[model samples]
Target: EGTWQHGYGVSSAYSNYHHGSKTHSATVVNNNTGRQGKDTQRAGVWAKATVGRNLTEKASFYYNFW
Candidate 1:
């Protein structure tokens, strides 16, 4: 009997999650704002997966690298 699993995910930059491939993401800026006047906080999309195995045999397995 062997079964154990845990999961965690975090996202930003306008809640990114497109289920058909197409995402190059990076946008997180809020380093001590200098007296600004505009606030709206809501950006998180979590649903990802990854599993890899190819010791040696001309390895070829690609999935989600963004």
Candidate 2:
């Protein structure tokens, strides 16, 4: 028998610090020759776990850590 697991995540932020530069700082993305965007940060996380099966009638191994 075998098993596995995984995870992921993303985040962003837009702050108002330009002071009269615009109504409010924005977070944007480009779609063509022209582009515009705000200050932001993106991140992600990943992890996995696994399990092994006995290969023989009387052979087996196991391990764990946290």
Candidate 3:
């Protein structure tokens, strides 16, 4: 069992899918998916940009499934 994405899909217990924009010669990243420990799925999206790279740069939006 898994979830749905706007242009992607989940079909297993764990995943490492990714997506995003190459807005610069700098950074381009996307979502890294996998199963969680407690029961919920864990998703990681890489929102890359210039001037530095860190999660503290800004909040991110990710896609997931059920």
Candidate 2, residues 1-66, lDDT tens digits: the string is: 112122111222112222222232223332232333343212211112122222222211221212
Task: Give me the displacement of residue 41 in model 2, in angstroms.
Answer: 14
Question: What shift in Å separates residue 64 of candidate 1 from its native position after superposition?
Answer: 16
TM-score of each: 0.18, 0.17, 0.16
**Model 3 compared with the native: what TM-score?**
0.16
Tens digits of per-residue lDDT for model 1, 1-66: 111122212221122222223332222232222111122222333322222222221211122323
Q: Residue by residue across 1-66, what tens digits does model 3's lDDT show? A: 222222212222222333332211112123233222111223333222312122232212233332
Candidate number with greatest lDDT: 3
Using alpha carbons, what is the TM-score of model 2?
0.17
Number of the candidate with higher lDDT, 2 or 3: 3
- Locate the minimum summed-lDDT window of 10 residues in model 3: 21-30
lDDT of candidate 2 at residue 7, scale 0 to 100 = 18
Which portions of model 2 miss their true places by more than 4 Å? 1-25, 39-66
lDDT (CA) per prediction: 0.23, 0.24, 0.26
